[PDB]
């Protein structure tokens, strides 16, 4: 079935007993043994006095692994989360760290439609890390403003431009207009500059209108759908990824997921949420806070670990990134990563065009192990001079 | 538009600076006429209050922080009027910003117009049961797993004859098609109604994947479902809202808190439980909201949001849960008033005289409590053996 790995701060100091109580309490409480939960492993961990002080009580730390029979839940994320953490989420110092799906269970999930290889083929960028940037100051501005920023980022060499995280349906830049206008801008840049850029557009609105809106977006010519998965739910992302009438990649944004993962004592771990579950659910890209942390590397690990059931997803460490960090990013994440320039690309002395060239040049230098400061490029130089 | 209240542990010891920072970064960022229309999209700091310092926290975080409450207002023009956009706007990026917690959201009158609130609410539930005065009594099936239909009916009948107003499915279910439990359950309950004149409602758990919920809910109604039990937080508040807004689902919805703890267990991060299990659930349309009982201050805060007067939404029934037996009835009515549901949980089946006797105990306990007469001075064997076993 499924193995849930929990990190617990046991105040009773009996990991064995507690583990067994959870195993029973979350299952059956002869023909019943068939649904009985099994304690697979108990791991004692080092004590933390600072936590004891914070909780005003001595707690024994440890990791508990429990196996829940497949017959105990429907094979979808809402049922899985409910079974493995519905009750425990309110039982105290317990955090869900990982979920190990059996090969049988994995068969019920789609995994990414495109994955790393599908995205690279789509963009026709086969070896180097990808480059992404974001519009800056879209709210209150018109379509002409969007078109100009999009054109500059594309001419700058960016592979993917995404909508500002908080851009919702509005009278100035509504969905279909953003898509139609954007598609024309990027086609024009392609026709003249030979560089193809993709536009990841924000898919928002009511949960029950998402499929209709996603299809309107596709019809309008959308390249990638940007989705705030955690504002809606993993099961919703999954249904979008499962629809073959939505033949475009989905880029997941981590907005709101912090409500689940910020604590070290409660919640659900970031690697499971932004790494494993997003991948199984169908996200082709996963944006997550950058370490500029093992946390970040863990997410990435689950997004790319070999798994015969699912394609790999593109890792997109975000925030606090400038051309100078490219070397660190590639060493830490490898070549199959997306360099997220964020909205900071527009801050370069030569606009988004200069910022993009700085990143593109930086990426190529990095792949040749050539230092950035020894690179003769006015754009990359001024970048290292202003940002570091 | 919408005002968000945050609890922050600032490691820069400058609440006024962090606040303005947040009000700007989460909103806007030229000729006069354009600047004028753009100012309409800017966030405004509404209130900044400092709080007592917590040394244990400083030690825990391995850094010193300044505790405070910040209130930032976001213009409606900046987001679509739906919970997903609202949560993304007020706590999207902030949820990953560090020690910050969404404590409350104050919707404006115009914004509230975009939400349904409960379909039935307190008055609607009371009219369904024809119980207009005292608090209601609810119990949960017990040991249903691995049992047949005849067993369900028998336990259902016993709970009803015991005076229980609402019987609901337990949390862990794995043989008994919903339409079947619904149909058979209905049969049992109508029998008790036409024999004792007592009305009992059966709240059945609504399941399935997100995009099958509405069709499943309508089928449940068609089969004769009384109330739909729904694990809101396993799907999302926006899904609960769509169910509540659907006129083809003319039945009450009872919200269960499963998973919500993933959001509110921390005192430093997440979204507060009262905001979740109280305000949002009511606005989204939950007729009943189950939450851990104080048997503490969060329990009352939740109840407050569910019942506080609001011209835009009907009120919801508070349902404190866990650690409740007949002895606590006087307390519950004290802390939650008469418009509350007494959740006997599966504890009635433990009564020495079974569920029938356990239900009677609660029903006698509530009638007595409303008469102000102490339970100790009540000449009732069922109630006595209860207070004698539970205290």
Q: Give the active site residue among A57, A87, A107, A335.
A: A87
B93 assigned to active site: yes
Among residues 117-176 of chain A, which lie with CB inside 8 Å of chain B?
136-137, 139-140, 165-166, 168-170
Give contacts of B171 with chain A, Cβ < 8 Å.
86-87
Tokens of B223: 């089969």
Pairing of strands A38-44, A60-68: antiparallel
Q: Which domains does chain B have, with CATH numbers?
A: 1-115 (3.30.70.150), 116-391 (3.20.20.110)
A205 belongs to an annotated ligand binding site: no
Q: How was this structure determined?
A: X-ray
- Select the residue of B40, B89, B234 nearest A166 (Cβ to Cβ): B89
A164 belongs to an annotated ligand binding site: yes
Which positions ≥6 away from B371 have C-beta within 8 Å?
none
Give contacts of B270 with chain A, Cβ < 8 Å.
259-260, 262-263, 267
Q: Is B24 within 8 Å of chain A by CB?
A: no
Pinpoint the alpha helices (H) of chain B: 15-25, 32-38, 55-61, 83-91, 109-112, 121-129, 149-161, 178-196, 213-223, 232-235, 237-245, 261-264, 273, 281-284, 297-307, 329-336, 354-369, 381-390
**Cα B106 from Cα B275, distance rounded (Å):** 10
DSSP-based three-state secondary structure for A66? strand
Q: Is A192 within 8 Å of chain B by CB?
A: no
CB contact under 8 A, B261 and A257: no
CB contact under 8 A, B211 and A239: yes
> In sequence order, what DSSP letters do the residues of B136-176 get, joined into one string?
EEEEE--S-TT--HHHHHHHHHHHHHTT-SEEE--S-----
How far does A245 lie from chain B, in Å, by closest CA?
16
DSSP-based three-state secondary structure for A285? strand
Q: From residue A384, how far is each of A94, A324, A349, A380 by CA, in Å?
A: 44, 6, 12, 6
**Cα A274 from Cα B131, distance rounded (Å):** 48
Q: HSE of A315 in the Cβ direction (CA atoms, 13 Å)?
A: 27
Query: Which residues face B140 on adjacent strands?
Result: B168
Tokens of B69: 């409450």
Tokens of A242: 């499962």
Tokens of A276: 């494993």
Report resolution (Å) to 1 decimal: 2.0
Which residue, among B305, B322, B324, has the nearest Cα to B313 in the 3D structure?
B305
Q: How many CB pairs under 8 A join A and B?
A: 195
CB contact under 8 A, A258 and B97: yes
Query: Are the CB atoms for B381 and B352 separated by under 8 Å?
Result: no
């Amino acid at each position: 079935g499924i193995i849930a790995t929990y990190l617990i701060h046991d105040d009773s100091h009996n990991l064995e007993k507690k583990a067994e109580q959870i195993a029973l309490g979350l299952t059956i409480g002869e023909q019943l043994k068939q649904h009985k939960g099994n304690v697979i492993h108990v791991e004692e961990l080092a004590e933390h006095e600072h936590t004891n002080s914070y909780l005003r009580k001595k707690v024994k730390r440890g990791i508990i692994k429990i196996e829940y029979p497949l017959l105990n839940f429907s094979p979808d994320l809402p049922a899985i989360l409910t079974t493995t953490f519905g009750k425990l989420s309110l039982d105290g110092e317990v955090k869900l760290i990982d979920l190990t799906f059996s090969d049988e269970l994995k068969k019920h999930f789609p995994g990414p439609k495109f994955g790393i290889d599908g995205i690279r083929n789509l963009l026709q960028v086969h070896d180097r890390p990808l480059l992404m940037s974001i519009f800056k100051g879209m709210i209150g501005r018109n379509i002409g403003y969007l078109k100009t920023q999009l054109r500059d980022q594309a001419i700058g060499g960016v592979d993917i431009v995404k909508d500002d995280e908080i851009l919702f349906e509005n009278a100035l830049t509504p969905l279909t207009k953003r898509i139609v206008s954007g598609k024309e801008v990027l086609q024009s840049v392609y026709e003249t500059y030979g560089h193809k850029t993709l536009y990841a557009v924000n898919l928002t609105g009511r949960t029950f209108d998402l499929k209709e809106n996603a299809k309107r977006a596709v019809q309008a010519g959308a390249d990638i759908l940007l989705f705030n998965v955690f504002a809606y739910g993993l099961d919703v992302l999954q249904s979008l990824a499962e629809d073959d009438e939505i033949p475009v990649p989905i880029m997941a944004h981590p907005a709101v997921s912090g409500a689940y993962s910020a604590s070290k004592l409660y919640g659900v771990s970031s690697p499971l949420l932004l790494g494993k579950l997003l991948r199984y659910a169908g996200a082709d890209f996963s944006l997550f806070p950058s370490p500029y942390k093992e946390e970040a590397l863990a997410i990435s690990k689950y997004l790319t670990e070999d798994d015969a059931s699912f394609k790999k997803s593109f890792s997109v460490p975000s925030a606090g990134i400038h051309p100078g960090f490219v070397p660190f990013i590639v060493r830490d994440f490898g070549k199959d990563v997306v360099i997220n320039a964020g909205g900071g690309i527009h801050g370069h002395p030569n606009g988004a065009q200069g910022g993009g060239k700085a990143f593109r040049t930086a990426i190529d230098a990095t792949l040749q192990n050539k230092p950035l400061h020894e690179v003769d490029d006015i754009n990359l130089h001024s970048a290292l001079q202003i940002w570091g």
